[PDB]
Design a protein around this nucleic acid. Structure first.
Ligand SMILES: O=c1ccc2ncc(=O)n3c2n1C[C@H]3CN1CCC(NCc2cc3c(cn2)OCCC3)CC1
Lengths: 381, 511, 511, 381
DNA sequence: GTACCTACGGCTTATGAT
DNA sequence: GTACCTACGGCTTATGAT
DNA sequence: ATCATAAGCCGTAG
DNA sequence: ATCATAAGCCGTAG
C-alpha cells in the first residue's frame, strides 16, 4: 500500500501538501515526470471501483490503499493531506468514475467533506493554434464564443439600409441572437418540419385578428406554399388547406405536404399562435425584415461579396474564418507533454480548482441504486 | 481562484454519462439492427477494399485501422466483437468469413489477433449496397476530420434476423433470431395490405429460429411477446431412449443442446449431481462427439425405466432453460417498446426513402452526362472552323472565350424529349439551327483527343445519347408513379429471397 | 510409417537456429548500421506517406501495418523499438519525432500504444533519399508477395553516429556514439588521401560522444579500441564542492550522471550505503531537479573535507562505470572484427555505387523522354495531312498502321548531339529530311490533345528538348569522369555537414 | 499440474495412449478441437524452458508439470504414456525449443530415450492449389522438384539438332543437371565474379596443353573480353592481360575488369585449371555446345516461341508455369483448420512420425554450453 | 509467453430464516 | 484496467571459500 | 589475505 | 412447511 504506487513529497507536515488521484499507468507517468518534488503527491488507480451501496460489506475490500494511505479509517486523530484533488479525464467514463469516488467519500467520511478538503480539477479541453496565436479552451460554450469572435474580426457590412456601413457590437449582438434562435429552432425541430420554420423568417407577420377575412388567410397561405414549392429542390411538394372549426369562423390554416409516399397535415391553432416560441420567431422575423439586407457588402478583411441571404453571408464568413485554423483536442491526460500538464493543471498561480459543499441531507444517493429511481429519473424530454 | 460549487454537481455528471451510453453504446436501431461498433467495423472493411472474392488479410491491419480512424476505445472489445461474428454457432447468418481457431462450444477462447485471417461474406455486400450514391447522411468522427455513415442502406431486416442483447443504465433488451424466407413473406404480405392483423402476420411467421436446433413447448409466451413486447419461452433439448434388439440395456442419446450452453460445464455439473446422489439411475458417462455431429451417451442404471430419470433431468438439468424475450430499441434516438408491425413499417419506410434518394442521384448524374455529350457532339459536327480558330488563337483562354462568343451553325446531320434533357441550374439562355455554349462545354471540347475522329466514335456517341435519353425517361416515370416504386421493391425482395433462402432448423411442438 | 532416425538430428536443428539468428536478428550492417526491424519500420512509415511537415498519426496504425505486411513477430518488440528511438536521452540523433509520455530517466515506462503520436524527423528523409530510382535491390517478404529494400541508400554513416548493442548466439557487439561534424571531416580527409594513417584519423576524431555529457579519463582504452577493436573506457560524472561565503557548510552538487544509469536506483543505493555506515561523512540527501536541468544536492557531515568522501564515492558509487567497447558487424553476411578505416572505406564504396546507379537510371529516363518528344514535335510539324489521314481512316489501328507505313517530310522549321539522343534498344532503321516512326510514337501522336495547338506549346517543347539535351550531356560527362563523381560526393558531404552540424557535449580530460 | 491444462483420454491403460507437447494458447485450442477423444492427450506449454546444463539446480523448478504428469521422477515403477510425440512449429524458434526439450530428456531420463518412446512430428510446409489440383508439400527440395515437374509438363522442343523433337526424360535430366550446376556456381560466386562464370558456358574449351602457343591464349582471351564488353549493359568494362610466370612460358591469362572506381585482376593458374569445379563447368559447356540449340521451338502446351538462349527459354517456361498457381505457407500450428490439422499430422494412417536413437556417448551436449565450443563450432565456411 | 478485478439488468439457483 | 517468467553474451558487483 | 561462485542489466524474441 | 436473501452468467466497457 504505502510502497509500490504512492510517491510522497519532501515535506511531512500536513495541511501544506497536495494529493492527486488519476488513472494509473497512462497518466501517472506524465504526472510524476511533470509534478513538483516539494509538496506534491500522486496515487494512481486501477480501472474502476465497486459501489458502496449496490454492494455493501464491511468485509468486502480489494484495494483499500486509499484509506490506508489517507487515514486510519476514527478520522479526527490522523489528518494527513488536509488537501486532496481529483484529476480525471474529460470523457464520459471520467465523470462516471468521478461520481463513484464522490459517493464513496460521502458515504464513508462525512467530516472530510464537511470541512472542505475535497477539490475538483478542470483540465483544458481544446488547443487552438492559428500560426503564432495559441489558445487554451476548456468549455463548449467558450469554444463557441471563440469561433464567433474569430468569425467577427471587425467586419463591416454595407447594405442599402439607414446605416451606410453596418458593423460592430450591433452586428455582433444580432448574430448572437440569430444563433440562439437557430438553436431553439433546431431543438423544437423534433415536433414540426423545418421548411416552414425556416420560411417564417422571411414570411410576413401574423395576428389573431386576421381570422376575420378569409382572403387574408388565403393570400398568406398561398404565398407560403408558393415560396415553399419554389425553394423545394428535393423530392417533395406543398399544398394548402383552409378549414373552419368554430360556430362562425375561427379560421385556421392547414398545410398539406407530400413526402416520399405519405402526406401529413399541420394545423394552426390559438395555442400555436400564442406560443412564446412563435412569438420570438415573429419578433426576429420583423427585426430581420426591417433590415433591407438584399444588396449587402461585408468584408473580412481583404475581400467582400454581395449575396441575397444573411445566413449565406454568415456561412461564407464562417468558412473564411475557419479556412486555416488548427485545433487539437486532448481526449486523455496521458496524451499531453509534462510541462503542458504542469502549466495547465497544477500551477498554484494558473490552475482553476473547484470546491465542494454539503448543502442538504437528501435522497439523491438513495435514488442512485434501486433500479426504480434509475427507471424514472431519465425524464429528459 | 476557487469558486464555490454546490454538491448538486453529482446529478449533472451522472445524467450525462447515462444519456451518452443509452444513445451511443448498447441499444441497437430499428432501421438496421446494428450497434455502432459493428457499423464502424463494416465501414472500415469496405473502405479498405476487402471483398469476399479476394485473398484473406491479417486481423492486425483491420484492428489497427479501426482503432486509428473511427473507434478510439482500445482493442480487446473490438477484437472480441470481430471474433463473435465469425462463429457459426452464435449467429444464424454470419457476416465475417474467417479462417483459424475461432473457439468452439467447449468454451475455448480464440487464438491471438496475429494468427487469424478475415474477409467479408457474400451476404455482407447486401448490407452496404449503394453506399456511394448519396443515400444516407455522414457524421464527423471524434476529431472532426472524417465522415461516417449514420445508418446503412440495408436490404435485409437484420434486427429480426439476428437480434442482439445489451444492458444499458436503465434499460435492457433481448431479441431471438428468425428465419429469412418467412420474414420476406411477411414483408410481402404487409406490402400487399397495410392493415393486416397480428393474427395474419403470425400465420406467415410461426416462431423463432436458432443456430442450433431445439424444441419449443409454449405457444402462449411467443404470442404474448409478439403482441405486447414481453414474454417467456422454454427451450428443450432433443433426446430419446434406446434399447438394443437383444438383452443389452437402456441408453440415452443427446443430439443437440439448448442455445448458449457450455458443454464442459454441463458434463461436470451432471457428474457432480450423480456424485451427490441427488439424481438416481445414472451409472457412468461417456462421449462420442466427432466431426459428424455432437453425440453424448449416458448409461442407464440397470432395472430403471429411465424416463422418470429423463424427466428429473429436464426439471433439474440445464437441458431445459428459459429465455427473457424483451423488445427494446431506438426509434428516433429514444427507447420505445415496439412490436412486430412497428418494426416492419419502419423497415418499409427506410427502404422507400433509400430508393427515392438513389433514383434522384442517378437522374442528376445522367442529366449532367447527357448535357456534356450534347456539346461534344455539336463540336464534332463543325470541325474545320474550330481548327482554324484554335490555330489562330495565341492563348488557350482567349480561344475558349472566342468559342463562347460566337454562335454555331448546327449542321443538319447533327440534329429528343420536350424537356428534362437539360440540368436545373442551367439558364434558359443556352440551347435556343441556333445554339450557344458554356465555359464548361468549351473546356470539354478543348479536352478532346484525336482518336475521336474515326467512323466508330460518332455511332458510339449517338448510341450513348439514345441510351441516356431512355434511362432518364424511365427514371422520371419511376419518380412519378408510386406503383412502379412498389413493384421495384417487390421485385428486389423476391430476388433477395430466391438468392438467400434456406430451410428450417428448429421445431415448435405445441405442448 | 516410422523411419528410424539417428540422434544427431540435434546438431542440424540448433545450427540452423544459430545461423538464422546471427544473420537476421541482432548484428547490424557496416553499410548503414541498422537492424532489420528498424529498416522495416522506416520503410513502412515511408510507404504510408508520413513525412515530417504533416500532421501526427496514432501508433496503432503503424504498428498494425508493420505486423501485417513485413514483420510477423508480435507487437511488444516492435512497439518497444519504436519507443526507444523517440527518447532524446537514448540516441545522439533521434529519428522518430513523437508526442506523448515516452518515459524518462527515472525508469518510468511509456504510455500505452493507443495514446502516443509519431512522425518522421527531418534527418530521417536523409536516410531514405532516392529510394524509388532503382538504387538498391528488393527482397521478397515472408510469403513472397511484397518487396523490401535490402540496404538503405543512406547519406550518413549511421553506424559510427549512433551504434548499437546486440547479443547473438556466439558473438556480441557494442559501439559508442560520435559527433557528426568530426566524422564528416574524417571522411573528407580520407577522400583526399587513400593511404591515411590511424594517427591522422585520430587527429580529426578525438573521441566518442554521448547524449548526456560526462568526463572521460583514459586515452589508452579508446586508442587500443580504434586500432584493434577491443578496449575499455571509464565514465566519470561531473560534480564539485561548494562552500558559502559565510559560515554555512560544505555541499556537493551533481549536474549530470553517466550513460544509462537509473537515477532512482542510484538514490536508493546511496541511501542504503549511508544507512549501512559503509560510507562516512554523509548527513542527509535532497533533490532539486526541475525543468531547467538535473540537480542533486548532498549535505556533507560537519567537520569533513568531503573530498575523501567524493573519492570513496567515485570508487564505490555508480558515478564511475566502465564500458566494453567491442566492434563487430556484418561485412558480406559474416561477422568480422573491423576497425575504423574499414568502416570508412565501406561507406565510401557504398556511396559511389549508389551515385553511379542513380545516374544511370536518370540518364535512361531522360533518354526515353527525349525520344518521345522528338516524334511529338515531328508530328506537330506536319498537321494537315495527318488530319486528313485520320479523317479518312475508319479504324484507329489502321490509322496507326498507315502512319507507320509512310515516310514524312520533316519541314525545315522542324530541324543536336552526334549521338546519345536515342535509346539503346532502338534499331538503326529509324530516324535516318527523311524520318520514320514507331508504334509507340504513333500511339503517343494519337494521344495528343487540342491544347497543344497554340503559340506557347511549340516554344515549351523546344525549351524542354534543349534542357534534356543539356542534362543528358552532363550525365554522360559525369559517368565518363571519376573526378567529377568525387567532386559531387564532396559537395554533398559538405552540404550535409553545413545543414546538420552542432557542438560537442562531452569532454575528454586525459588523466 | 494435473488439472488446468492436461486433457487425458478415455483409456487409462498405458502403452496405448498418445501424448503431445505444443505451444499453449494458440495451438492447444485447435489441437483439442481436432484431436480424438479415445486415446489422445495434449499438454500445452508456456514460452521457453530453462536449460539443464547452463543453470543446474535440483531446487530450480518453475513448472515441473511435465515430470509430475509423466512419471514420479525412479522411472521404471510408473510408466504411463509409453508413447510421447513433440509437435513444434517450422520456424527457427521451433527448432530451438525442440533442441532444449531434447537435451532436457537426454540429461534427465536416459532410459525413456533408450527404450524408444520419444517421437518427432513432421508438419507440412506448403499448400499448393492449382484450381482443382491440391498438394501438401513439406520440404524445400520437394517444393523445388514439384515446381520443376509443373514447369516440365510434357513439353516438346524442336531445334535443328539430330533430334527432330527433343523432349522427355532426356530434357528433364538436362534441366536438372543445369540447375545443379547453376546452384554450384551461385555458391562459388562468393569467390569470383559472375560474368566470366556465366560466359564460360558458351566460350570454347581449354586445356593445359594450350600454354605452348601465345596466339591461342591471345585469341581465347580476346574473344572472351569482346563478348563480355558486348554483353555488358551496366556501367563496367573489360580488359585483358597476358603474363609469363615461368622459366620459359607457363602462359597464364589474366583478366582486368574496371568497376565503378577500382580495377581488379583475376589470374588463371594450374590449380584453377585442374579444379573439379572448372572441370564440371567445362563438361557442361561441351555438352551444351554439342546441342546447336539456336533455332529452337518448345511448346507447353498451347504456345511455342523461338529464342536464342536456353536459360531464357527455361525462364519463359517457368513463367508460363507459375502464371496462375496458388501457394499457402503455414507459419504456425495455430493457423490451419482443425480437420486439416487432424488429417495432416495426427491420423494413424496418414501421419509420418520419426524415432530417435541413442547411438553413442559423445560430448556434443558438453560443447553445447561453454562459450568456447559456441565460439568455435560455427565453422560453416 | 500467460490471469484476474470492476459496472450494468434480468433470469436462474442455492441456502438459511420464520 | 493492469505484472511477471523464459533465451542469448559480456560486462559488472557481491559473497563465501582456501 | 587472496580466490572461486553467485547475482543483475543491456535489446529482439517467446 | 413456506418465504426472504444471497450468489453466478450473459456482452461492451474500465
Ligand atoms: O497475458 C497476460 C497475462 C496476464 C496479464 N496481466 C496484466 C496485463 O496487462 N497483461 C497480462 N497479459 C498480457 C497483458 C495484456 N495485454 C493483452 C494484449 C495487448 N496487445 C496490445 C495491442 C496489440 C495490437 C494493437 C493494439 N494493442 O493494435 C495493432 C494490432 C495488435 C497488450 C496487453
Amino acid at each position: 500500500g504505502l510502497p509500490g504506487k504512492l510517491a510522497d513529497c519532501q515535506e511531512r507536515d500536513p495541511a501544506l501538501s497536495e494529493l492527486y488521484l488519476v488513472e494509473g499507468d497512462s497518466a501517472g507517468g506524465s504526472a510524476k515526470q511533470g509534478r513538483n518534488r516539494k509538496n506534491q503527491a500522486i496515487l494512481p488507480l486501477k480501472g474502476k471501483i465497486l459501489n458502496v451501496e449496490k454492494a455493501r460489506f464491511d468485509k468486502m475490500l480489494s484495494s483499500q490503499e486509499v484509506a490506508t494511505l489517507i487515514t486510519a479509517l476514527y478520522n479526527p486523530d490522523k489528518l494527513r493531506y488536509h488537501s486532496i484533488i481529483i484529476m480525471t479525464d474529460a470523457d464520459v467514463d471520467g465523470s462516471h468514475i468521478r461520481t463513484l469516488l464522490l459517493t464513496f467519500f460521502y458515504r464513508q467520511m462525512p467530516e472530510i467533506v464537511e470541512r472542505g478538503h475535497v477539490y475538483i480539477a478542470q483540465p483544458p479541453l481544446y488547443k487552438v493554434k492559428k500560426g503564432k496565436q495559441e489558445q487554451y479552451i476548456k468549455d463548449d460554450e467558450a469554444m463557441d464564443q471563440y469561433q464567433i469572435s474569430i468569425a467577427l474580426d471587425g467586419a463591416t457590412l454595407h447594405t442599402n439600409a439607414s446605416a451606410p456601413a453596418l458593423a460592430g457590437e450591433a452586428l455582433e449582438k444580432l448574430v448572437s441572437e440569430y444563433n440562439a434562435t437557430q438553436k431553439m429552432i433546431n431543438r423544437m425541430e423534433r415536433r414540426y418540419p423545418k421548411a416552414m420554420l425556416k420560411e417564417l423568417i422571411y414570411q410576413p407577420t401574423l395576428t389573431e385578428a386576421d381570422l376575420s377575412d378569409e382572403q387574408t388567410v388565403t393570400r398568406w397561405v398561398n404565398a407560403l406554399v408558393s415560396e415553399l414549392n419554389d425553394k423545394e429542390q428535393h423530392g417533395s411538394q406543398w399544398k394548402f388547406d383552409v378549414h373552419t372549426n368554430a360556430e362562425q369562423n375561427l379560421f385556421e390554416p392547414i398545410v398539406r405536404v407530400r413526402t416520399h409516399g405519405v402526406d401529413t397535415d399541420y394545423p394552426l391553432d390559438h395555442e400555436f399562435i400564442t406560443g412564446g416560441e412563435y412569438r420570438r420567431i415573429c419578433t426576429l422575423g420583423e427585426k430581420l425584415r426591417g433590415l433591407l439586407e438584399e444588396d449587402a457588402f461585408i468584408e473580412r478583411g481583404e475581400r467582400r461579396q454581395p449575396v441575397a441571404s444573411f445566413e449565406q453571408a454568415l456561412d461564407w464568413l464562417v468558412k473564411e474564418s475557419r479556412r486555416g485554423l488548427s485545433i487539437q483536442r486532448y481526449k486523455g491526460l496521458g496524451e499531453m507533454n509534462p510541462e503542458q500538464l504542469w502549466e495547465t493543471t497544477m500551477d498554484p498561480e494558473s490552475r482553476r480548482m473547484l470546491r465542494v459543499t454539503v448543502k442538504d441531507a437528501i435522497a439523491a444517493d438513495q435514488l442512485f441504486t434501486t433500479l426504480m429511481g434509475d427507471a424514472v429519473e431519465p425524464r429528459r424530454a | 481562484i476557487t469558486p464555490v460549487n454546490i454538491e448538486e454537481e453529482l446529478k449533472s455528471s451522472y445524467l450525462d454519462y447515462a444519456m451518452s451510453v443509452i444513445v451511443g453504446r448498447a441499444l441497437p436501431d430499428v432501421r438496421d439492427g446494428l450497434k455502432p461498433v459493428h457499423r464502424r467495423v463494416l465501414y472500415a472493411m469496405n473502405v479498405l477494399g476487402n471483398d469476399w472474392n479476394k485473398a484473406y488479410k491479417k486481423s492486425a491491419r483491420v484492428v489497427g485501422d479501426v482503432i486509428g480512424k473511427y473507434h478510439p476505445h482500445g482493442d480487446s472489445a473490438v477484437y472480441d466483437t470481430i471474433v463473435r461474428m465469425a462463429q457459426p454457432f452464435s449467429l444464424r447468418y454470419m457476416l465475417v468469413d474467417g479462417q483459424g481457431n475461432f473457439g468452439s462450444i467447449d468454451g475455448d477462447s480464440a487464438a491471438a489477433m496475429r494468427y487469424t485471417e478475415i474477409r467479408l461474406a457474400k451476404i455482407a455486400h447486401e448490407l452496404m449496397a449503394d453506399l456511394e450514391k448519396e443515400t444516407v447522411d455522414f457524421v464527423d468522427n471524434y476529431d472532426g476530420t472524417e465522415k461516417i455513415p449514420d445508418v446503412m442502406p440495408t436490404k435485409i431486416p437484420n434486427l429480426l434476423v439476428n437480434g442482439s442483447s445489451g444492458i444499458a443504465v436503465g434499460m435492457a433488451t433481448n431479441i431471438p433470431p428468425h428465419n429469412l424466407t418467412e420474414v420476406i413473406n411477411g414483408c410481402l404480405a404487409y406490402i400487399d395490405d397495410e392493415d393486416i392483423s397480428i393474427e395474419g402476420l403470425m400465420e406467415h411467421i410461426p416462431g423463432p429460429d436458432f443456430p442450433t436446433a431445439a424444441i419449443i413447448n409454449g405457444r402462449r409466451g411467443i404470442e404474448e411477446a409478439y403482441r405486447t413486447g414481453r414474454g417467456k419461452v422454454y427451450i428443450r433439448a432433443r433426446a430419446e431412449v434406446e434399447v438394443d434388439a437383444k438383452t443389452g440395456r437402456e441408453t440415452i442419446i443427446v443430439h443437440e443442446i439448448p442455445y448458449q450452453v457450455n458443454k464442459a460445464r454441463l458434463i461436470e455439473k451432471i457428474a457432480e449431481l450423480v456424485k451427490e446422489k441427488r439424481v438416481e439411475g445414472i451409472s457412468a458417462l461417456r462421449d462420442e462427439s466427432d466431426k459428424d455431429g455432437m453425440r453424448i451417451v449416458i448409461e442407464v442404471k440397470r432395472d430403471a425405466v429411465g424416463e422418470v430419470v429423463l424427466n428429473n433431468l429436464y426439471s433439474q438439468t440445464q437441458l431445459q432453460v428459459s429465455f427473457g424475450i424483451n423488445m427494446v430499441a431506438l426509434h428516433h434516438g429514444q427507447p420505445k417498446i415496439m412490436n412486430l408491425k412497428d418494426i416492419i413499417a419502419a423497415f418499409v419506410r427506410h427502404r422507400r426513402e433509400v430508393v427515392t434518394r438513389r433514383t434522384i442521384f442517378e437522374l442528376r448524374k445522367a442529366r449532367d452526362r447527357a448535357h456534356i455529350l450534347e456539346a461534344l457532339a455539336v463540336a464534332l459536327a463543325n470541325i474545320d472552323p474550330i481548327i482554324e480558330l484554335i490555330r489562330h488563337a495565341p492563348t488557350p483562354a482567349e480561344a475558349k472565350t472566342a468559342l463562347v462568343a460566337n454562335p454555331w451553325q448546327l449542321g443538319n446531320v447533327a440534329a429528343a424529349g420536350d424537356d428534362a434533357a437539360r440540368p436545373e441550374w442551367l439558364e434558359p439562355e443556352f440551347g435556343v439551327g441556333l445554339y450557344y455554349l458554356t465555359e464548361q462545354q468549351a473546356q470539354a471540347i478543348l479536352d478532346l483527343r484525336l482518336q475521336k475522329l474515326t467512323g466508330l466514335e460518332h455511332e458510339k456517341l449517338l448510341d450513348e445519347y439514345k441510351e441516356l435519353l431512355d434511362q432518364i425517361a424511365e427514371l422520371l416515370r419511376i419518380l412519378g408513379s408510386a406503383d412502379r416504386l412498389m413493384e421495384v421493391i417487390r421485385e428486389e425482395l423476391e430476388l433477395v429471397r430466391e438468392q438467400f433462402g434456406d430451410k428450417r432448423r428448429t421445431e415448435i411442438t405445441a405442448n
